[PDB]
Design a binder for this molecule. Structure first.
Ligand SMILES: *[C@@H]1O[C@H](CO)[C@@H](O[C@@H]2O[C@H](CO)[C@@H](O[C@@H]3O[C@H](CO[C@H]4O[C@H](CO[C@H]5O[C@H](CO)[C@@H](O)[C@H](O)[C@@H]5O[C@H]5O[C@H](CO)[C@@H](O)[C@H](O)[C@@H]5O)[C@@H](O)[C@H](O[C@H]5O[C@H](CO)[C@@H](O)[C@H](O)[C@@H]5O)[C@@H]4O)[C@@H](O)[C@H](O[C@H]4O[C@H](CO)[C@@H](O)[C@H](O)[C@@H]4O[C@H]4O[C@H](CO)[C@@H](O)[C@H](O)[C@@H]4O[C@H]4O[C@H](CO)[C@@H](O)[C@H](O)[C@@H]4O)[C@@H]3O)[C@H](O)[C@H]2NC(C)=O)[C@H](O)[C@H]1NC(C)=O
Ligand SMILES: *[C@@H]1O[C@H](CO)[C@@H](O[C@@H]2O[C@H](CO)[C@@H](O[C@@H]3O[C@H](CO[C@H]4O[C@H](CO[C@H]5O[C@H](CO)[C@@H](O)[C@H](O)[C@@H]5O[C@H]5O[C@H](CO)[C@@H](O)[C@H](O)[C@@H]5O)[C@@H](O)[C@H](O[C@H]5O[C@H](CO)[C@@H](O)[C@H](O)[C@@H]5O)[C@@H]4O)[C@@H](O)[C@H](O[C@H]4O[C@H](CO)[C@@H](O)[C@H](O)[C@@H]4O[C@H]4O[C@H](CO)[C@@H](O)[C@H](O)[C@@H]4O[C@H]4O[C@H](CO)[C@@H](O)[C@H](O)[C@@H]4O)[C@@H]3O)[C@H](O)[C@H]2NC(C)=O)[C@H](O)[C@H]1NC(C)=O
Ligand SMILES: *[C@@H]1O[C@H](CO)[C@@H](O[C@@H]2O[C@H](CO)[C@@H](O[C@@H]3O[C@H](CO[C@H]4O[C@H](CO)[C@@H](O)[C@H](O[C@H]5O[C@H](CO)[C@@H](O)[C@H](O)[C@@H]5O)[C@@H]4O)[C@@H](O)[C@H](O[C@H]4O[C@H](CO)[C@@H](O)[C@H](O)[C@@H]4O[C@H]4O[C@H](CO)[C@@H](O)[C@H](O)[C@@H]4O)[C@@H]3O)[C@H](O)[C@H]2NC(C)=O)[C@H](O)[C@H]1NC(C)=O
Ligand SMILES: *[C@@H]1O[C@H](CO)[C@@H](O[C@@H]2O[C@H](CO)[C@@H](O[C@@H]3O[C@H](CO[C@H]4O[C@H](CO)[C@@H](O)[C@H](O[C@H]5O[C@H](CO)[C@@H](O)[C@H](O)[C@@H]5O)[C@@H]4O)[C@@H](O)[C@H](O[C@H]4O[C@H](CO)[C@@H](O)[C@H](O)[C@@H]4O[C@H]4O[C@H](CO)[C@@H](O)[C@H](O)[C@@H]4O)[C@@H]3O)[C@H](O)[C@H]2NC(C)=O)[C@H](O)[C@H]1NC(C)=O
Ligand SMILES: OC[C@H]1O[C@@](CO)(O[C@H]2O[C@H](CO)[C@@H](O)[C@H](O)[C@H]2O)[C@@H](O)[C@@H]1O
Ligand SMILES: OC[C@H]1O[C@@](CO)(O[C@H]2O[C@H](CO)[C@@H](O)[C@H](O)[C@H]2O)[C@@H](O)[C@@H]1O
Ligand SMILES: OC[C@H]1O[C@@](CO)(O[C@H]2O[C@H](CO)[C@@H](O)[C@H](O)[C@H]2O)[C@@H](O)[C@@H]1O
Ligand SMILES: OC[C@H]1O[C@@](CO)(O[C@H]2O[C@H](CO)[C@@H](O)[C@H](O)[C@H]2O)[C@@H](O)[C@@H]1O
Ligand SMILES: *[C@@H]1O[C@H](CO)[C@@H](O)[C@H](O)[C@H]1NC(C)=O
Ligand SMILES: *[C@@H]1O[C@H](CO)[C@@H](O)[C@H](O)[C@H]1NC(C)=O
Ligand SMILES: *[C@@H]1O[C@H](CO)[C@@H](O)[C@H](O)[C@H]1NC(C)=O
Ligand SMILES: *[C@@H]1O[C@H](CO)[C@@H](O)[C@H](O)[C@H]1NC(C)=O
Ligand SMILES: *[C@@H]1O[C@H](CO)[C@@H](O)[C@H](O)[C@H]1NC(C)=O
Ligand SMILES: *[C@@H]1O[C@H](CO)[C@@H](O)[C@H](O)[C@H]1NC(C)=O
Ligand SMILES: *[C@@H]1O[C@H](CO)[C@@H](O)[C@H](O)[C@H]1NC(C)=O
Ligand SMILES: *[C@@H]1O[C@H](CO)[C@@H](O)[C@H](O)[C@H]1NC(C)=O
Ligand SMILES: *[C@@H]1O[C@H](CO)[C@@H](O)[C@H](O)[C@H]1NC(C)=O
Ligand SMILES: *[C@@H]1O[C@H](CO)[C@@H](O)[C@H](O)[C@H]1NC(C)=O
Lengths: 624, 624
């Protein structure tokens, strides 16, 4: 095993465990110290204003298993510190018959048991578990734990009658899944159900959804309500909140609803951020965010989706969330988005970016798998004065339209997503910032034009506004992680409405994924404008490439170039002519970003271990 | 629920939990503070000379489940003190994927991990488990833990490759069971295998048996040897030590070998006690003690047996233990005998006495189930100058015979068992002792003759020597726990060689067992004697009746008389005439015995709990 990054890569499968630990590793984002991570969990803003973030964790392994909560905290979403206790950076782990198979995703009741922050989580035990298997009741249940030390440790309720697990009965038969409880307060839902509480007797101020589905008959999000305020054992099943069909799709802008939901959450937003009104704010919109399984040919069969919903009250004192329009939260290699409230009327969302090594060829050599996305403020994106001649506008696919009285303009409403400003400020302020001169891309434009300033490593951000003619057939974007032999091309093609990431040349290492990523982006044309604009922000962080368009569209992906000098960046142009011109302005390079884990040394590997021959006997975890 | 013990019992199933806690409860023996117990485990003499005793335990329940090690200690086998830690009187409990289904029986390596006492125990996980079920590999494995604080707590080795569990591969396919590791040193076995260690490479100073069997083909005791002295991870399978047939029986004196072994141990004894020679002591005998399953119509399908064995060395460097003769360790409601070495060349054995409430009618009202037997010294019983005309003598069923050179007398050899002298001394010294005048039972004898002194409660011992004519047809023995309406009759009938406990009148409460207990007792007739003698010792301790004959035969059983005055005792006589006389001498009553748990209050119940609806979902434990 040679680690010479000035020559072509050898056979890297001969390299030892964690020998490639720093080679492709993100530095500017949330990631475990080592080993396996997946879904964010247990997210809450603590009493001191800091953010507690948990995550599904399997230390000293590079596949999933013994799944536990790892945790850390931050005062600004950006610079983090690990918890360190008797189990290292873990704070909840399998320990009881009811959760021994894994401590799955959970969410926080901020004033819970004895007034302490309390997690409701999926506690798993033995038996077939999965949407394509024949799971039985009891394999997935829901349990409580609380913390008296602000998340350094958690105390589980005892096992037994009237204690853990607190939710165990399946609400319908033949579930595909029964997990990922999302606890939330909702003046909106309380107002809607206030006339029906005699029917159900459930009058608590907390609701909880549980994600799943029914075999052969599509996904389900099940709604529960806390039975009595200030009491946390009894949760009353109201009914299905969201019901979708077996592999139903709302269309090209909306992914596919698959067979089973995961990590679903419920929020209410307005143009400024989170909305906590009872229905009285006419600018507020109810949203559900959710993952779907088995409705996708690639990306681990996983779509992270969202839908705007209109709530209807059923006669049995339950709620139907009728989907009004439906979109995609991220179009790339990310999943398991969790959202949580943050003071100042914010709802903040973060997901998990998996690697692109699905055959597990270099995972041991990495010594880790996975990272988070950046933390994102959610809000209602409102575009005013939209031209009715915007192509495809009245499809109303992942947005809504409201005509002006005179019919000459439209107001467009959709889900907005933008990187939390704390992170943008810290990134910019800690970087070497190069403000770049505008560039007109015309007949003289090369295919690739390097920026006048270049990055110095694999940790940078780019911003640009691309102004296109209304009938352009030109393409433009950014090339990143670029040398002559390796590069990753981010293209937007207004004629097809497709944002793509072409990765055929991303790396000389052939075992990594190289498929083309794709997102749909609607450029809403403004009344009286003779052009249309794409605002693109791109973060390059080790192997992560995370793309944001117009505070709306997100696409996370991976690139693993071998060569030390595959760090360059610049502009891409295709079909730009004297007459079909692309004006690029607002160009900025931020070189360096932030060291997100200042207390950690560069190499936080502790080695990898094998569970031994019993792993195959038990059949629950891969074992490595 | 009335607790009036001066009138007939009402419907006691209406009584609350633990309302009958003290009513039938032993006071003078090892018993858990409350709840469920079964097999002794983890027995060893500590560095300070005290005895550590563990037991299979399920606190606050009255059926088996979450099976854990409860523990206590004693300096004299007799007066005990509970450990008290973070889990009360438990010291090992289910906590890892490999043992979450139960911490089953285990035994002690005295100088183990880092020089500390170390337990090798059966760690159980999910799946069908049982001799009549289709168990698979991995469900039962063997794991290590060690103590740095003399048994107050135990630290398990980590889960994984080269750590726990340390034995997981089945030595043959289709096992009926794979548990109860018994670790022991043996100069005998080391000497026998010394010429074969090249074949196996196993040269350690510890051996371990694991108890089981093969479906359809009888029980098996599997022998392992520690691979290297001072190292405790690697244990090498040598071969089957004991192989018996599917429900094979050696005869009327030997129970039945069933389909599966449990709690098996290996020892070597001589007339004085434990023998630690390499084979050079010609008075020493190799013994195996073991439980069998599914070879008995009653007594929970369980026989606690023993066999004298002759070891043969196989060509593959393993040992066959050929059964020379075979007996019964206890003929009544006891099982799961464990033996352990004690300083002064002793081997001490103790078992578990279950209740006689197999339909679980009053278990909740008790608030506990189970106790230990008394602790017993094992030795080789040798009877010299035995008459060749002793009936059935050359059957050599559970004994061996050696003729004198002239053929006029025989030396008989069998397993001896006697209550440890520490307990006999303490019992006698703390009791009110009444030495009773001898009684000739003849034509004038009533059926029942009360002793001249009577017990004052349900805690007493009786001794007597019954001298019978060589051709008697008379019966005699002891009645205990006796009033006019309730009593338990212990009879010996020399003509049939049967010791019986008749329990048709033991209690007015009809839900308890009332079947007749039976043991075979061989009165070895001495050359020149014109009579034959039965030395009977009986312990009455709450509901326990524990009978010892001639330091050889043991029979433990249960009686639950309701009436407060059903405490009396005396002599039984049947068919005694002027010519067929039974001379009773050495009669002594010890009233009171010892308070075995002086620190415990009378009622150590902490209530009972239910595991809730998930107990049936998981399907592992009853839940109560
Ligand atoms: C199979 O058997 C298993 C083993 O038995 C069993 O698991 C065990 O289950 C039991 C019962 O559910 C659990 O017991 C609970 O423990 C909770 C605390 O748990 C935390 O702390 C313990 C112990 O703490 C110490 O010991 C460890 C180990 O040495 C040290 O690390 C610590 O530093 C600490 O040491 C100090 O204290 C020691 C003595 O205790 C000293 O020796 C020492 O010197 C130190 O000073 C830990 O062991 C726990 O760790 C385990 O669990 C965590 C997850 O929780 C894991 O991460 C970890 O790996 C371990 O597995 C843990 O950290 C108790 O809170 C709980 O007590 C209450 O509940 C019951 C009711 O259910 C009540 O009886 C009792 O009164 C308590 O409730 C009161 O208090 C709470 C708030 O504090 C109130 O909400 C409640 O209403 C009530 O209030 C009362 O008082 C008020 C007045 O103040 C009054 O106003 C109220 O009205 C009311 O009266 C309970 O004891 C036990 O932890 C499990 N153990 C393990 C190892 O798993 C398993 O379930 C079984 N399985 C099956 C299938 O049956
Ligand atoms: C799923 O995830 C699960 C959770 O991660 C996982 O279970 C965990 O597995 C790990 C790894 O196997 C276990 O870690 C081991 O822990 C052993 C000690 O265990 C005992 O102590 C711990 C911790 O102790 C404290 O914390 C608790 C909780 O707060 C307190 O109650 C205590 O008071 C104590 O607190 C003090 O210390 C704290 C910090 O640690 C402070 O915060 C605090 O202020 C106090 O000061 C307990 O948690 C354990 O309890 C659990 O387990 C018991 C059974 O064991 C249960 O009954 C109980 O309910 C709990 O479940 C327990 O009591 C360590 O000994 C062990 O460390 C060694 O082994 C590894 C190799 O495997 C080495 O890396 C390491 O060096 C250690 O080995 C050295 O030491 C030993 C002798 O001491 C030598 O034999 C050895 O050779 C070596 O010697 C070295 O040093 C020598 C020089 O001195 C040198 O000469 C030698 O050459 C050599 O270098 C390991 O850390 C962990 O306990 C599990 N946790 C739980 C909760 O289960 C599970 O397996 C996962 N499942 C799957 C399927 O993957
Ligand atoms: C005295 O000790 C006991 C512990 O032994 C304490 O706890 C009680 O324990 C018993 C079991 O011994 C439990 O009985 C079982 O109850 C099941 C239904 O329970 C529900 O209804 C009752 C009645 O109002 C409620 O009290 C329960 O509420 C509690 O539990 C829920 C969780 O479900 C919590 O949310 C609450 O907060 C409470 O904690 C329940 O809502 C019942 O199904 C079960 O069924 C069988 O057993 C009986 C008797 O043998 C049969 O008649 C019946 O046919 C069922 O038999 C089964 O038997 C075999 C083998 O098991 C199976 O193969 C069959 O298919 C069949 O299913 C049983 O009756 C009791 O619920 C529980 N009480 C609790 C926790 O409060 C007592 O509390 C304690 N008392 C005191 C004063 O301390
Ligand atoms: C680097 O990290 C790893 C952790 O990832 C550390 O531990 C090693 O981990 C790997 C797995 O990543 C283990 O590989 C597996 O080994 C199995 C056979 O092992 C035995 O032989 C080896 C070789 O001499 C010994 O080292 C082992 O000894 C250790 O374990 C025993 C317990 O058994 C202990 O007693 C010892 O003390 C040691 O701790 C063993 O004796 C092997 O069966 C297993 O098989 C598959 O995997 C490969 C690769 O994918 C395939 O070629 C093969 O076909 C098998 O594939 C399976 O794949 C699928 C899915 O799993 C199944 O469906 C198939 O049916 C099929 O079974 C694998 O190769 C390795 O043993 C282990 N080493 C240890 C513990 O020492 C490294 O130590 C660490 N390195 C350093 C320097 O720190
Ligand atoms: O770590 C479990 C956690 O991850 C999610 C989201 O991806 O589920 C994954 O893990 C399950 C258990 O292996 C799989 O069945 C599932 O297909 C997979 O997506 C959460 O739903 C869960 O809490
Ligand atoms: O934030 C104002 C308002 O919202 C409520 C809704 O019941 O609480 C939400 O907002 C808090 C601040 O972000 C969160 O801590 C809380 O978890 C969330 O439910 C009100 O309590 C509050 O007055
Ligand atoms: O507590 C388990 C312990 O008891 C024994 C001896 O009786 O086994 C009993 O428990 C097993 C598990 O429920 C049963 O399969 C078995 O039939 C029963 O005798 C020990 O062998 C075991 O270690
Ligand atoms: O007891 C004398 C002699 O026996 C050995 C056998 O190797 O140890 C046994 O006896 C000890 C005392 O009862 C026990 O502690 C020990 O566990 C048992 O193997 C010798 O070590 C000792 O010299
Ligand atoms: C980058 O490195 C490779 C190999 O060292 C080299 O061929 C190339 O010229 C270098 N510089 C570039 C592409 O600017
Ligand atoms: C309420 O009605 C809906 C629609 O019929 C149904 O799915 C749900 O199960 C009902 N709730 C109950 C039975 O609690
Ligand atoms: C919205 O405006 C477009 C263009 O003016 C028109 O085609 C459509 O009918 C209008 N819809 C409504 C509801 O008025
Ligand atoms: C650098 O980053 C840190 C950590 O997020 C942040 O607190 C600090 O303000 C940043 N420095 C700037 C903006 O100059
Ligand atoms: C653009 O995207 C869609 C997928 O939504 C695809 O079917 C179409 O072929 C793409 N067109 C071009 C020109 O890339
Ligand atoms: C024992 O008690 C019962 C009921 O109180 C009574 O009938 C009997 O006479 C008492 N005394 C005896 C049997 O000596
Ligand atoms: C040794 O021989 C015996 C008798 O053939 C056999 O049962 C045992 O399995 C053998 N040991 C091995 C293969 O280790
Ligand atoms: C043992 O003694 C009896 C009676 O003297 C006799 O029947 C038998 O043959 C003797 N056995 C041997 C081996 O001498
Ligand atoms: C009473 O019993 C205790 C506890 O076993 C014992 O130590 C003491 O010697 C006994 N008293 C006597 C024999 O007088
Ligand atoms: C004595 O015991 C045996 C069982 O070993 C039995 O078959 C026989 O009938 C009994 N005989 C008498 C008279 O009790």
């Amino acid at each position: 095993c040679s680690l010479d990054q000035t020559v072509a890569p050898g056979n890297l499968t001969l390299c030892g465990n964690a020998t490639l630990f720093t080679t492709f590793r993100p530095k500017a984002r949330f990631i475990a110290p080592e080993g396996w991570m997946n879904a964010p969990m247990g997210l809450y803003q603590r009493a001191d204003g800091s953010i507690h973030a948990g995550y599904q964790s399997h230390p000293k392994h590079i596949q999933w298993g013994n799944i536990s909560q790892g945790a850390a905290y931050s005062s600004d979403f950006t610079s983090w510190t690990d918890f360190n206790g008797s189990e290292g950076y873990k704070t909840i782990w399998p320990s009881q018959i009811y959760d021994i198979r894994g401590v799955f995703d959970g969410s926080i009741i901020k004033e819970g048991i004895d007034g302490y922050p309390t997690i409701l989580y999926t506690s798993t035990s033995f038996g077939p578990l999965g949407a394509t298997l024949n799971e039985a009741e009891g394999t997935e249940t829901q349990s409580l734990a609380y913390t008296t030390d602000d998340g350094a440790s958690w105390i589980k309720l005892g096992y037994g009658a009237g204690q853990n697990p607190v939710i165990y009965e399946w609400p319908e038969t033949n579930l595909t899944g029964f997990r990922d409880p999302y606890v939330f307060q909702s003046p909106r839902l309380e107002a809607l159900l206030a006339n029906t509480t005699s029917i159900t007797n459930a009058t608590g101020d907390h609701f909880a959804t549980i994600s799943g589905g029914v075999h052969g008959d599509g996904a389900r999000l099940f709604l529960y309500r806390q039975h009595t305020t200030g009491e946390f054992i009894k949760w009353t099943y109201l009914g299905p909140l969201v019901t979708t069909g077996y592999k139903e799709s709302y269309g090209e802008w909306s992914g596919n609803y698959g067979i089973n939901f995961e990590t679903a959450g419920v929020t209410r937003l307005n143009p400024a951020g989170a909305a906590w009104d009872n229905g009285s704010d006419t600018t507020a919109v109810d949203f559900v965010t959710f993952g779907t399984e088995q409705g996708r040919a690639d990306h681990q069969n996983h779509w992270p989706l969202w839908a705007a919903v209109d709530y209807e009250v059923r006669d049995n004192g339950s709620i139907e969330a009728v989907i009004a329009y439906s979109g995609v939260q991220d179009w790339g290699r990310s999943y398991a988005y969790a959202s949580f409230p943050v003071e100042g009327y914010r709802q903040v969302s973060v997901g998990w970016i998996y690697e692109d090594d699905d055959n597990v060829i270099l995972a041991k050599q990495f010594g880790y798998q996975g990272a988070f996305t950046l933390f994102r403020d959610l809000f209602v994106k409102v575009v005013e004065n939209v031209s009715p001649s915007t192509p495809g506008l009245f499809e109303q696919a992942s947005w809504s339209t409201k005509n002006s009285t005179d019919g000459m303009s439209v107001t467009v409403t959709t889900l907005g997503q933008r990187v939390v400003p704390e992170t943008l400020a810290a990134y910019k302020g800690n970087s070497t910032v190069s403000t770049l001169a505008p560039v007109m891309l015309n007949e003289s434009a090369a295919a690739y034009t390097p920026f006048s300033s270049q990055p110095t490593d694999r940790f940078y951000a780019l911003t640009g506004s691309f102004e296109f003619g209304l009938n352009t057939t030109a393409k433009a974007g950014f090339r990143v992680l670029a040398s002559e032999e390796e590069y990753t091309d981010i293209w937007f093609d207004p004629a097809s409405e497709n944002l793509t990431v072409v990765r055929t040349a991303s790396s000389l290492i052939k075992s990594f994924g190289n498929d083309t990523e794709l997102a749909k982006v609607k450029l809403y044309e403004i009344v009286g404008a003779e052009s249309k604009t794409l605002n693109l922000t791109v973060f390059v962080d080790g192997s992560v490439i995370e793309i944001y368009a117009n505070d709306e569209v997100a696409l996370s992906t991976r690139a693993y170039p071998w060569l030390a000098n595959s760090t360059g960046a610049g502009l891409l142009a295709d079909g730009t002519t004297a007459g079909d011109v692309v004006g690029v302005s607002g160009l900025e390079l931020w070189d360096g970003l932030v060291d997100a884990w200042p207390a950690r040394p560069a190499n936080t590997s502790q080695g990898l271990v094998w569970d031994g021959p019993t792993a195959a006997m038990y059949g629950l975890f891969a074992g490595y």
